[PDB]
Design a protein around this ligand. Structure first.
Ligand code: AKG
Ligand code: FE2
Ligand code: FE2
Lengths: 378, 377
């Protein structure tokens, strides 16, 4: 329950214990409550910005008195003398006196991992623009699963930029706001089109890594070459469940990535292939064979085992039962969460031409747009 | 020295030990050497991209023979029967058997931390756009020190965008391509007021965080409004040295950040105030009193200590001896590495007018421009 019943303050005033109507208890420290006061002199009413620093809060701050009344908690602090009230709902929702999961390599509860049994989420270009429920569902699919298709879009150059603008902002690079991906498939070219088709995340040599990628089809007359996506979190999960020490090595040591092109682009980054939050949640995958650079940061005594784990992760990524495959017809596109979901394509099986456009955008904007839609539809 | 004298191979063939002319030794594994082969069947001559996957290398790859010859190491791998040569200079530069520092909270070799004892580095607008040496030095100062002033620039709206274009690309956000830093009615952010701002990094509620920020002065004629920058890495170093447990609390638990300053925007992030690499190198600082959200990820029995460490970090950041203070004149600007160097301003009021412009860019582009300038020079 989120309905407060009563409160006791410790003799020290250093914390209080809130009891709810279902019998549950939750303890809150004086300093935390003071810092999180929601009144107009702590949080600006117009923009929600906090108006005080930690330095502004007296170091000896304590709870003087407190009371539960009519679904809310009244708290008065000393030595300031400041009285504030907290809604019951807010206290329960923002509780920290709970059992924090510490499992190393766990995923956020908001994501669902997948393999080849997962259908490609698909949404309509026009519906996502006119119906906020469709837009919400489209962005929610990218949030939960890390990818989604958009179909029935226009066969127009730069349309992918319009897609990005539906939720956020394009990460412009040296290659432009977007780049052309043109392919001529014929008997002569067929050989080299088979090279470098391992699933990968783009640009692990950029820090910060571009967090979303959009690929948009304008023309396709070549047979085969289905797009493939692989869940980096599923691959990492499989490694962890099988080989926790190997998982720990890939998460516990940075790799090196580098792109040094002939057209004056030289990009480098130092980041692990599996990135965890400091409390163990899996937050990002970086995997790209073509731009992996010399691993200079891994101690000698761990290098062999690191390489073994790296190989094993690659085997999960190369596993065909991990890939979700789909065709892209003119006007169709897909987005990947480039911090999680890898992409590639299968081999071409017939001659022809293909024209895709690619760009990057950032997840923060997508989540904001999703948050706003959820509030509007709630 | 990078001159190889002799080599030995382990019984298993799993690694070799290279001895250089100065007496120093460095061990290299067979698998690592094979994966890093520099030849045209492993690395493209055109762009240096890797042509193999990890799966392409035989699992039982081992050194069959290794020899040192005029400054280089020649190695043959079984079972491929592939022979490659590694220059001594390359081996020295890319060694991993170097007893790398494992000091938790250490800074990267390239960065140099600072406090108020060092005057702000300043570069000239006209020089950096015309003279490539001056551009290199300017960008390298930002890379090393996380901060540089650019002075004698034009008093022109949008000039900061031209500045960004000198080295990289603008991170456009909800705030605009660039934003107007001036007092606004119904402000969406306390930046758009006359209030003083505690030293902070921008947008800790944004993941990915903007990695660079440009602030550019058009008018600054009101009393107050001085700029201050604080090296977040120096502040973190001080906490580390004084209070290792406090440092570990701030590095080891996520904080929460949130911005909901108007309708149509709701940004949230879950990141520690001190972000370390997996091996203990400091990567980023996130510190912002105005958009720190309720800390829900810290265990009850650690919350008081966490707040004490947060307070102490704030004390280092508020320390006048840590802040480099200056008042921008029209046409002057500065850039901060927004993952590292915090910025602040004193409040302003009275007759006179203040108008700054701000925008974000990214370090990846800056480093590329710098890398290219160094190669060309
Ligand atoms: O007004 C200033 O000098 C700084 C304002 C600021 O912190 C910002 O716009 O990010
Ligand atoms: Fe790609
Ligand atoms: Fe700021």
């Amino acid at each position: 329950h989120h309905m407060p019943r009563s409160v006791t303050a410790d003799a020290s005033g250093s914390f209080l214990t809130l009891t709810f109507e279902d019998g549950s208890e939750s303890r809150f420290h004086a300093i935390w409550l003071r810092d999180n006061a929601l009144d107009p002199e702590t949080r600006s009413p117009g923009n929600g910005q906090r108006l005080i620093t930690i330095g502004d809060i007296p170091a000896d701050t304590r709870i003087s008195t407190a009371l539960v009344d009519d679904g809310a908690l009244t708290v008065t602090f000393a030595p300031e003398g400041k009285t504030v009230t907290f809604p019951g709902k807010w206290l329960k929702s923002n509780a920290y006196d709970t059992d924090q999961s510490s499992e190393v390599g766990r995923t956020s509860p908001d994501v669902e991992t997948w393999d080849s049994s997962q259908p490609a989420p698909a949404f309509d270009w026009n519906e996502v623009q006119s119906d906020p429920k469709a837009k919400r569902d489209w962005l929610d699919a990218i949030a939960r699963l890390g990818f989604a298709k958009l179909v029935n879009g226009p066969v127009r150059e730069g349309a992918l930029i319009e897609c990005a603008s539906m939720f956020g902002f394009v990460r412009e690079t040296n290659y432009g706001k977007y780049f052309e991906v043109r392919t001529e498939v014929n008997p002569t070219n067929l050989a080299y089109t088979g090279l470098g088709l391992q699933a990968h995340t783009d640009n692990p040599y950029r820090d910060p890594v571009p967090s979303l990628q959009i690929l948009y089809c304008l023309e396709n007359s070549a047979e085969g070459g289905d797009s493939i996506v692989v869940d980096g979190f599923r691959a990492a999960e499989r490694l962890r469940d099988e080989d926790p020490e190997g998982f720990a090595l890939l998460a516990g040591n940075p790799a090196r990535f580098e792109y040094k092109g002939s057209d004056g682009v030289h990009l480098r980054a130092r980041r692990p292939m599996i990135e965890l939050s400091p409390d163990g949640e899996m937050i990002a995958i970086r995997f790209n064979n073509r731009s992996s650079a010399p691993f200079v940061d891994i101690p000698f005594e761990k290098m062999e085992a690191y390489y073994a784990a790296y190989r094993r992760l690659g085997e999960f990524i190369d596993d065909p039962e991990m890939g979700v495959s789909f065709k892209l017809e003119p006007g169709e596109s897909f987005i990947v969460d480039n911090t999680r979901v890898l992409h590639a394509r299968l081999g071409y099986s017939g001659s022809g031409s293909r024209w895709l456009q690619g760009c990057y955008a950032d997840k923060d904007g997508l989540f904001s747009t999703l948050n706003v839609l959820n509030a509007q539809l709630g």
